[PDB]
């Protein structure tokens, strides 16, 4: 027992370990397990970073304070040491001799040690199950749920002797009570000051966007590491003193260079640099000496921090012994004086700590979490009126015409960012009708590039492939007997990879109606459960649906024809192909129009602009008359596609004779091109 167990109550007796904060329902709960005659060995169940070892240790603090119930007193938690057990040796068989010897040793201690085990399922078990079953060994185990189920949930010793009690992770305010629990410990680790929006924003946003790990832990190493970064920033010499310091080192060692001067007559002219030397000396001693004043302020601050910690260790040892006159002479004696000189120190640091910032901001936590997640917290919390009001201009950068669409859609996005919508629905539910490549593709990449900040959030799934009855098994999930019964279909994998994404559904009318029913279910729910066996949320994505029934009616219906016509017979075609309660579950019915010749001209322009970039690579620009712009305007257009042969007319009239000529060497970089017209085409000239 000298070799294999750590007395946790000893380190609690030195105050070497932190107090637990909160979670006394779990503590009392475990106390309600420890009382028990059989199942003397409880099983903690929880995730990493939860606090279960702190449950054990604060339980030991309740032991050493005697605040545990009577009879539970008299026994001492000495937890099983990791790596004292096997431990490390050349042979096999040592493991069982050590197991035996510690069982004889706890046998001769007569229960007065209660034995905690970290990670029960890893640490076999031959001599264990009898002494467990007798109840003589009053140990304690702790593991996770899933690794219990895979270590095993099943077998008779494990389910027999033990009692599983599981926990939750704490709530946001609960984590605030945690950080207000241990913030003094981290402050004397850190010697900084702490803002309250830093910790409530840390718990809230770390709660929201970190789905992997759990409370409290992600908040803990956010606050800890960020505060360490502030320690490194503070404890280094100030950057103005650094930028001065480099040229001042340069003049003081250039002074070393110019003491033994070669020409006292010819290089007597150096005395200007001797005067600048003295000026940099004066301003240098001023800036440095200001920083020494900061060092005196921060030094006295850390002293009254430390002496307040000594007052708290003293008052708590007075709680352990129960010396009440000692408690009064401490709490009236030391504490209010260090409180008032604390407030004088903090108001003085509110005054003169101009250059250095002991206070940490919520903005620091935003920067560190941006360095983990990748999203800037500017994008969370800039002027939301700036981005949300510039959104229309953002669209009319790369999506031309189509004002009604960007209005209704954009306002829907606005009230989505409001939070006024249902948290039991996906974000945006939209139907689009119109030609392809005229801006639909631009709309998807544009909007995912706006909110989801990249074009990658778009997921295209065509429904033209999905015709037969088996199409639902294709895109959703397979039946058994197949690997797709572990894989699922396309959609579940798509949102399964990208939680924050945009879903695109092309030519959606061709499918069987069995598709359309679960389409109604993802319209109602924002959830669906796959062949694999998991629920997949859609509360962080927007479904975008396109059909091509009345797209040969959408080329004509806008602008110049009535929406009641194509709405009547195409909603009638919905009545053939859906029920319009599905239309009740889409949010908007959005219609597009073909482009005016000015739009077509401008998308020819911005289509050329990337070629102007790639000639900016080589060293060229290009000037084009409205004649040749009418050639790309006429040849780049078709009624069936709109803008899709634009690249075709451009490459076929332009890219091949032009870069033909650069493969002839006829074109000199740094000499500008003007694409002047040919006979009836485009030709190139330097």
Q: Which residues are annotated as a binding site for ATP?
A: 46-53, 434-441
Structure tokens at 623: 């000037």
Distance, CA of 376 to CA of 374 (rounded, Å): 6
Stretch that binds ligand AGS, among 15-23, 384-392, 407-415, 526-534 (CB under 6 A): 15-23
Antiparallel, parallel or unpaired: β 76-80 and 5-7: antiparallel
Residue with tokens 């060692």: 253
Is residue 274 a contact residue for its own copies (CB under 8 A)?
no
Least Å from the CB of residue 665 to its own copies? 11
DSSP string of 236-302, one letter each residue: SPPHHHHHHHHHHHHHHHHHHHTTS-S-TTGGGGGHHHHHHHHHHHHHHHHHHHHHHHHHHHHHHHH
Least Å from the CB of residue 384 to ligand AGS? 27
> According to CB under 8 A, which residues from 24 to 53 bind its own copies?
28, 31-33, 35-39, 48-49
Cβ proximity to its own copies: between 156 and 296 the closer is 156
Binding partner at 51 among ligand AGS, its own copies, none, C-beta below 5 to 8 Å by kind = ligand AGS
Is residue 331 a contact residue for its own copies (CB under 8 A)?
yes
Is residue 240 a contact residue for its own copies (CB under 8 A)?
no
Within 8 A by CB and 6+ apart from 12, the residues are 57, 60, 61, 63, 64
Q: Are 512 and 471 in contact (CB under 8 A)?
A: yes
Binding partner at 104 among ligand AGS, its own copies, none, C-beta below 5 to 8 Å by kind = none
SS3 181: helix
Backbone angles phi, psi at 165, to 5 degrees: -130, 125
Backbone angles phi, psi at 617, to 5 degrees: -60, -50
Residue 441 burial class via C-beta count within 10 angstroms: exposed 0-12, middle 13-18, buried 19 and up:
middle
Residue 496: how many CA atoms within 13 Å on its side-chain side? 16
Binding partner at 22 among ligand AGS, its own copies, none, C-beta below 5 to 8 Å by kind = ligand AGS
Bridge-partner residues for 624, per DSSP? 675
Binding partner at 479 among its own copies, ligand AGS, none, C-beta below 5 to 8 Å by kind = its own copies
Cβ proximity to ligand AGS: between 20 and 356 the closer is 20
Q: Which of 2, 14, 25, 48 binds ligand AGS (CB under 6 A)?
A: 48
Is residue 513 a contact residue for its own copies (CB under 8 A)?
no
> According to CB under 6 A, which residues from 631 to 660 bind ligand AGS?
643-644
Least Å from the CB of residue 648 to ligand AGS? 11
Length of the chain: 686
> According to CB under 8 A, which residues from 351 to 410 bind its own copies?
none
Sheet holding 541-546, edge to edge: 458-462, 501-506, 541-546, 428-433, 588-591
Q: Going residue by residue from 400 to 439, which x/- string records binding to ligand AGS, judged by CB under 6 A? A: ------------------------------------xxxx
Binding partner at 267 among its own copies, ligand AGS, none, C-beta below 5 to 8 Å by kind = none
Binding partner at 437 among ligand AGS, its own copies, none, C-beta below 5 to 8 Å by kind = ligand AGS
Least Å from the CB of residue 439 to ligand AGS? 3
Sign (positive/negative) of CA torsion 542, 547, 553, 554? positive
Is residue 178 a contact residue for ligand AGS (CB under 6 A)?
yes
Q: Which residues of 318-344 are buried (b: 16+ CB within 10 A; e: fewer)?
A: beeeeeeebbeebeeebeeebeebeee
Distance, CA of 628 to CA of 610 (rounded, Å): 18
Least Å from the CB of residue 298 to its own copies? 11
Distance, CA of 78 to CA of 508 (rounded, Å): 66
Q: Going residue by residue from 93 to 122, which x/- string records binding to its own copies, judged by CB under 8 A? A: ---x---------------------xx--x
Q: Which of 2, 90, 351, 354 binds its own copies (CB under 8 A)?
A: 90
| Residues at the site binding ligand AGS, with contacts judged by CB under 6 A | 18, 20-23, 46, 48-54, 118, 142, 156, 178, 181, 216-217, 399, 436-442, 595, 603, 643-644
């Amino acid at each position: 027992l000298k070799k294999y167990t750590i007395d946790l109550t000893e380190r609690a007796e030195q105050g070497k370990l932190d107090p637990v904060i909160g979670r006394d329902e779990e503590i009392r709960r475990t106390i309600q397990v420890l009382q028990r005659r059989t199942k003397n060995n409880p099983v903690l169940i929880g995730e990493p970073g939860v606090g279960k070892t702190a449950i054990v240790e604060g339980l030991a603090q309740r032991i050493i304070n005697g605040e545990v119930p009577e009879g539970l007193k008299g026994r001492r938690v000495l937890a099983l040491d990791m790596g004292a057990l096997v431990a490390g040796a050349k042979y096999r068989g040592e493991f069982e001799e050590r197991l035996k010897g510690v069982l004889n040793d706890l046998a001769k201690q007569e229960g007065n040690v209660i034995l905690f085990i970290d990670a029960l399922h890893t640490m076999a078990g031959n001599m264990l199950k009898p002494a467990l079953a007798r109840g003589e060994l009053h140990c304690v185990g702790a593991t996770t749920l899933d690794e219990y189920r895979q270590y095993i949930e099943k077998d008779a010793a494990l389910e027999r002797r033990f009692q599983k009690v599981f926990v939750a992770e704490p709530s946001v305010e609960d984590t605030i009570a945690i950080l207000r629990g241990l913030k003094e410990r981290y402050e004397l680790h850190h010697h900084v000051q702490i803002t309250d929006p830093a910790i409530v924003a840390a718990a809230t946003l770390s709660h929201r966007y970190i789905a992997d790990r759990q409370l409290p832990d992600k908040a803990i190493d956010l606050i800890d590491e960020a505060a360490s970064s502030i320690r490194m920033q503070i404890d280094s010499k100030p950057e103005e003193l650094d930028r001065l310091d480099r040229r001042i080192i340069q003049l003081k060692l250039e002074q070393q260079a110019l003491m033994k001067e070669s020409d006292e007559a010819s290089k007597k002219r150096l005395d200007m640099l001797n005067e600048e030397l003295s000026d940099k000396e004066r301003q240098y001693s001023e800036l440095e000496e200001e920083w020494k004043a900061e060092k005196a302020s921060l030094s006295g601050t850390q002293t009254i921090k430390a002496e307040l910690e000594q007052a708290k260790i003293a008052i708590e040892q007075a709680r352990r012994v129960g010396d009440l006159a000692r408690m009064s002479e401490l709490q009236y004696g030391k504490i209010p004086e260090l409180e008032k000189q604390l407030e004088a120190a903090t108001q003085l640091e509110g005054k003169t700590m101009r250059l250095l910032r002991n206070k940490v901001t919520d903005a620091e936590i935003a920067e560190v979490l941006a360095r983990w997640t990748g999203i800037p917290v500017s994008r969370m919390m800039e002027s939301e009126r700036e981005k949300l009001l510039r959104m229309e201009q953002e669209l009319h950068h790369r999506v031309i015409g189509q004002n009604e669409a960007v209005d209704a859609v954009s306002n829907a996005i606005r009230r989505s960012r409001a939070g006024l919508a249902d948290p039991n629905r996906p974000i945006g539910s939209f139907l689009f009708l119109g030609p392809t490549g005229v801006g639909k593709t631009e709309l998807c990449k544009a909007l995912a590039n706006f909110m989801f900040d990249s074009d990658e959030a778009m997921v295209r799934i065509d429904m033209s492939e999905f015709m037969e009855k088996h199409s639902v098994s294709r895109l959703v999930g397979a039946p058994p007997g197949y690997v797709g019964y572990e894989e699922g279909g396309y959609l579940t994998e798509a949102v399964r990879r990208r939680p924050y994404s945009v879903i695109l559904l092309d030519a959606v009318e061709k499918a069987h109606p069995d598709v359309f029913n679960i389409l109604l279910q993802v319209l109602d729910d924002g959830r669906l459960t796959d062949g694999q066996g998991r629920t997949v949320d859609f509360r962080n994505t927007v479904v975008i649906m396109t059909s091509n029934l009345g797209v040969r009616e959408t080329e004509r219906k806008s602008i110049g024809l009535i929406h009641q016509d194509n709405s009547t017979d195409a909603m009638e075609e919905i009545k053939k192909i859906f029920r319009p309660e599905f239309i009740n579950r889409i949010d908007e019915v959005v219609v597009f129009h073909p482009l005016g010749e000015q739009h077509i001209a401008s998308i020819a322009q911005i289509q050329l602009k990337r070629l102007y970039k790639r000639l900016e690579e080589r060293g060229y620009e290009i000037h084009i008359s409205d004649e040749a712009l009418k050639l790309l305007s006429e040849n780049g257009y078709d009624p069936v596609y709109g803008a899709r042969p634009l690249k075709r007319a451009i490459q076929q009239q332009i890219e091949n004779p032009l870069a033909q000529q650069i493969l002839s060497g006829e074109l000199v970089p740094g000499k500008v091109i003007r694409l002047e017209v040919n006979e009836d085409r485009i030709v190139a000239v330097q």
